[PDB]
C-alpha cells in the first residue's frame, strides 16, 4: 500500500530535505491548478499555519464524496490508493484533513497517518471546492519549516503559467501576504 511511499519517499517525491518538503505543496496546488485548467476553479488559497500545517483551498467542483466501485468513498480512493498524487502527501503526513463542498452540503474527511476516519456530512452550502490541510511528517522530513520566499516564487510562476487564475498566499507565522493574478 502507502507503506511503499513511506519506505522509499525519494521514488515518489525526490528527496526528504527542503525540496521534498516543498514538493508536498506543489502536489496539492497542482491538483487545484488542474481543476482550473479543466475550467472549474478560478482561485487557489494557500495558508502556511503556525502549527506546521499547510492548507490549500480551491473553488473547483470538489473531490467526489460518493462511494466508489472499490467499496469506499471516492475521496478515500484518491487519498489512499497509489495526474492526482495527493495519496503521496497523505502517506508522508501525520495528519491530513479534507473539507469538500459539493452536492448541496459541506463534507469532512480526516486521516490519521493516512488512515481514514468517518466521512462527516454537515451544513448545507450552495458553494463548491476542495480544502486540504496536511501536517508533514517530522520523522520522514529533514526539516518541516516551510520557506515563505520559496512558496511565493513558485506560486507566482504558477500564476504566470495559468494567466487569469488567482493564487493567494498567507503565512500565518510572521501575517505575510501575497496575491498573484495576471492578465
Q: Point out which residues bind ligand RWX (CB under 6 A).
A: 28, 31-32, 35, 56, 58, 60-64, 78, 84, 86, 130, 132
Verify binding: residue 58, a copy of itself, rule CB under 8 A.
Answer: no
* CA angle at 147 for the pair 53 and 99, rounded to the nearest 5°: 25
> What is the spatial distance between Cα 59 and Cα 45, in angstroms, rounded to a whole number?
9
**Which residue's entry shows cell 493574478?**
181
CB 87 within 8 A of CB 3: no
Q: Nearer Cβ to a copy of itself, position 34 or 172?
A: 34
Backbone phi, then psi, for 120, in 5-degree steps? -90, 115
CB of 98 to ligand RWX, least distance (A): 8
> What is the spatial distance between Cα 114 and Cα 22, in angstroms, rounded to a whole number?
19
By CB under 8 A, the count of residues binding a copy of itself is 26
Q: Mark 136-175 with x for binding to a copy of itself (rule: CB under 8 A) and - for no binding.
A: -----------------x--xx--xxxxxx----------
Positions 62 through 91 that interact with a copy of itself (CB under 8 A) = 82-83, 85
Amino acid at each position: 500500500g502507502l507503506e511503499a511511499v513511506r519506505k522509499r519517499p525519494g521514488m515518489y517525491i525526490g528527496s526528504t530535505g527542503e525540496r521534498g518538503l516543498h514538493h508536498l505543496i506543489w502536489e496539492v496546488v497542482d491538483n487545484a491548478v488542474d481543476e482550473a485548467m479543466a475550467g472549474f476553479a478560478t482561485r487557489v488559497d494557500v495558508k502556511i499555519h503556525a502549527d506546521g500545517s499547510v492548507e490549500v483551498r480551491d473553488d473547483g467542483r470538489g473531490i467526489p464524496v460518493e462511494m466508489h466501485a472499490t467499496g469506499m468513498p471516492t475521496i478515500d480512493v484518491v487519498m489512499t490508493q497509489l495526474g492526482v498524487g495527493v495519496s503521496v502527501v497523505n502517506a508522508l503526513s501525520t495528519r491530513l484533513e479534507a473539507t469538500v463542498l459539493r452536492d448541496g452540503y459541506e463534507w469532512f474527511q480526516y486521516y490519521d497517518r493516512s488512515v481514514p476516519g468517518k466521512l462527516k456530512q454537515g451544513g448545507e452550502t450552495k458553494e463548491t471546492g476542495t480544502t486540504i490541510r496536511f501536517w508533514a511528517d517530522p520523522e520522514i522530513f529533514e526539516t518541516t519549516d516551510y520557506n515563505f520566499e520559496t512558496v511565493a516564487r513558485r506560486l507566482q510562476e504558477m500564476a504566470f503559467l495559468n494567466k487569469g487564475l488567482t493564487i493567494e498566499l498567507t503565512d500565518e507565522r510572521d501575517g505575510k501576504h501575497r496575491v498573484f493574478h495576471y492578465p
